[PDB]
Amino acid sequence: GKSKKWKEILKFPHISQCEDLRRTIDRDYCSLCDKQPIGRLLFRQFCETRPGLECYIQFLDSVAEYEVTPDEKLGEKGKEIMTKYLTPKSPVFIAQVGQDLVSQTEEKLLQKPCKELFSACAQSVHEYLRGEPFHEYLDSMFFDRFLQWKWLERQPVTKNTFRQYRVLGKGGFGEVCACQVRATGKMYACKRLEKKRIKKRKGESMALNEKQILEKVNSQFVVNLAYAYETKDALCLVLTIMNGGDLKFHIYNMGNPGFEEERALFYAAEILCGLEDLHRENTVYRNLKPENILLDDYGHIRISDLGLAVKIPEGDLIRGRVGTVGYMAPEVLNNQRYGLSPDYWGLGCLIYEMIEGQSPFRGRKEKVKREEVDRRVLETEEVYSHKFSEEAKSICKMLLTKDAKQRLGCQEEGAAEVKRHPFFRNMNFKRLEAGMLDPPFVPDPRAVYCNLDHTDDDFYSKFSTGSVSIPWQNEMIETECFKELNVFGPNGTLPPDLNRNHP
Ligand SMILES: Cc1[nH]c(/C=C2\C(=O)N=C3CC=C(C(=O)N[C@H](C)c4ccc(F)cc4)C=C32)c(C)c1NC(=O)c1ccoc1
Numbered sequence: 001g002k003s004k005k006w007k008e009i010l011k012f013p014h015i016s017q018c019e020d021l022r023r024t025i026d027r028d029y030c031s032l033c034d035k036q037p038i039g040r041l042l043f044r045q046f047c048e049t050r051p052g053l054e055c056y057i058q059f060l061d062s063v064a065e066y067e068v069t070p071d072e073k074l075g076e077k078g079k080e081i082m083t084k085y086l087t088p089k090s091p092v093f094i095a096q097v098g099q100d101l102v103s104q105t106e107e108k109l110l111q112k113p114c115k116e117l118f119s120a121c122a123q124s125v126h127e128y129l130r131g132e133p134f135h136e137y138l139d140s141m142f143f144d145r146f147l148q149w150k151w152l153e154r155q156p157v158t159k160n161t162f163r164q165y166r167v168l169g170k171g172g173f174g175e176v177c178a179c180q181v182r183a184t185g186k187m188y189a190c191k192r193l194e195k196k197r198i199k200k201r202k203g204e205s206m207a208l209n210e211k212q213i214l215e216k217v218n219s220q221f222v223v224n225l226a227y228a229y230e231t232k233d234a235l236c237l238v239l240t241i242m243n244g245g246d247l248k249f250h251i252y253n254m255g256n257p258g259f260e261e262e263r264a265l266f267y268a269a270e271i272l273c274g275l276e277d278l279h280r281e282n283t284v285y286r287n288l289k290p291e292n293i294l295l296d297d298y299g300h301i302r303i304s305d306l307g308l309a310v311k312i313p314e315g316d317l318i319r320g321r322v323g324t325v326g327y328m329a330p331e332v333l334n335n336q337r338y339g340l341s342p343d344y345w346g347l348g349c350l351i352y353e354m355i356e357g358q359s360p361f362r363g364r365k366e367k368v369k370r371e372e373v374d375r376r377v378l379e380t381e382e383v384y385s386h387k388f389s390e391e392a393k394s395i396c397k398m399l400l401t402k403d404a405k406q407r408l409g410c411q412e413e414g415a416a417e418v419k420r421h422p423f424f425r426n427m428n429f430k431r432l433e434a435g436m437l438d439p440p441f442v443p444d445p446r447a448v449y450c451n452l453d454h455t456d457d458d459f460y461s462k463f464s465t466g467s468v469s470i471p472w473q474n475e476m477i478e479t480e481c482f483k484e485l486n487v488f489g490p491n492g493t494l495p496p497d498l499n500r501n502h503p
Pocket of ligand 1: 168169170171172173174175177189191192193223239241242243244245294304305306308447448449450473
């Protein structure tokens with residue numbers, strides 16, 4: 001439901017309005033041709049015009065397909081790629097990959113196949129585009145078009161930019177709403193943080209902390225921040241909309257009182273990726289419990305409620321006793337200097353509680369006091385049943401290790417150590433991260449699974465930053481606002497908005 005005059009709102013500005021952007025934009029190689037979604041498409045579209053650069057883009061696309069291809073079908077896809085791109089007489093022959101590297105893969109495919117067979121060649125291709133083909137695209141109309149999109153991205157975001165519909169859930173310092181961008185129509189989840197509730201409770205640094213962490217991290221398994229604006233009496237965070245309910249609901253209301261091992265395996269594999277992306281920013285979540293694992297419309301999961309997340313300084317440990325009863329690692333209950341370990345303890349609580357149907361330290365029918373639940377986390381060894389395969393028992397007790405020094409994933413290797421666990425012996429992570437594995441449960445669409453100080457003005461400056469770059473560009477692509485607006489002159493000629501002669 002895009003606005004009536006959305007083409008006027010997203011109307012491209014004349015390229016002369018983008019001179020300040022031309023020189024302030026860092027021209028990093030693939031910060032503009034890969035990371036930034038629209039930038040990637042425009043550079044790709046720049047190569048579509050050239051005959052030589054054409055075949056280099058088609059090759060990379062074919063390599064991406066090989067990485068997710070099933071195992072028994074690798075040797076097949078492998079041959080197709082070489083006979084199409086690496087044969088010297090091909091119509092789409094790759095040249096900048098030296099003959100001393102096409103004969104290399106000749107030996108790779110002569111043996112068993114590995115999903116990273118063409119990795120050597122792919123890097124060689126990018127290394128070529130990084131040079132002349134990139135600097136050419138910089139002086140091309142597509143980069144001028146890229147600046148036009150950036151101009152729109154940076155525009156101020158206010159309240160008329162959106163269209164709240166209902167209040168879906170309420171929590172601390174505010175509540176959550178269902179927000180919609182008018183010009184694009186995309187549905188988001190607004191987070192109305194009441195302004196006078198923050199200053200009273202003196203939690204201004206905790207609000208910023210979550211807002212900075214959310215914008216810095218993007219992922220398919222953690223709620224993303226697309227906008228952050230200030231308003232009268234409230235401060236808003238525009239986050240991903242999750243209509244599939246939480247994992248607590250599906251474990252106890254719509255299961256056994258639990259899941260099958262294979263079903264829990266899926267959700268676990270996605271949660272692990274969600275934690276890996278948060279650790280790439282050396283950020284610890286510390287709030288891993290079933291009601292915080294939400295499901296989207298397709299059946300996939302994301303982590304939410306990062307209010308307790310904090311960015312750990314590299315080589316430094318934090319101290320704090322936060323979390324929810326039962327889901328606090330022993331090192332957190334002890335109030336010690338810990339790192340990212342509490343999340344792997346939480347992941348152990350999650351996998352266990354999904355398969356068995358109860359907390360590993362409190363029965364579903366047991367009524368115990370906070371003190372006793374805590375003693376078991378520190379003094380009691382969990383017990384397993386015939387619902388856990390020998391691989392499912394191992395990962396849970398390894399992740400539920402009391403001593404965070406011998407806990408899985410808490411080594412220099414990180415989350416990579418967990419993915420290699422036999423419990424994920426049947427999980428292809430490259431295909432999961434690509435969204436190619438069908439979720440085990442698909443939520444139904446109609447389902448309903450449920451004062452004037454100046455210092456206050458200074459705190460707003462760092463919060464109300466505006467639209468987040470990557471989520472914003474994707475929104476333009478999702479809503480097909482890019483497909484419609486990204487139009488040029490007929491027969492590869494400059495359009496009016498990109499002609500410095502007549503504005
Ligand atoms: C669609 C939808 N999203 C959400 C919710 C979210 C979302 O989507 N993304 C995110 C990201 C982060 C949070 C988050 O920080 N939370 C904590 C607890 C919080 C903190 C401060 C507050 F002030 C309020 C809450 C929530 C969400 C909810 C409920 C529905 N409602 C249903 O799913 C539904 C429909 C019928 O029945 C139930």
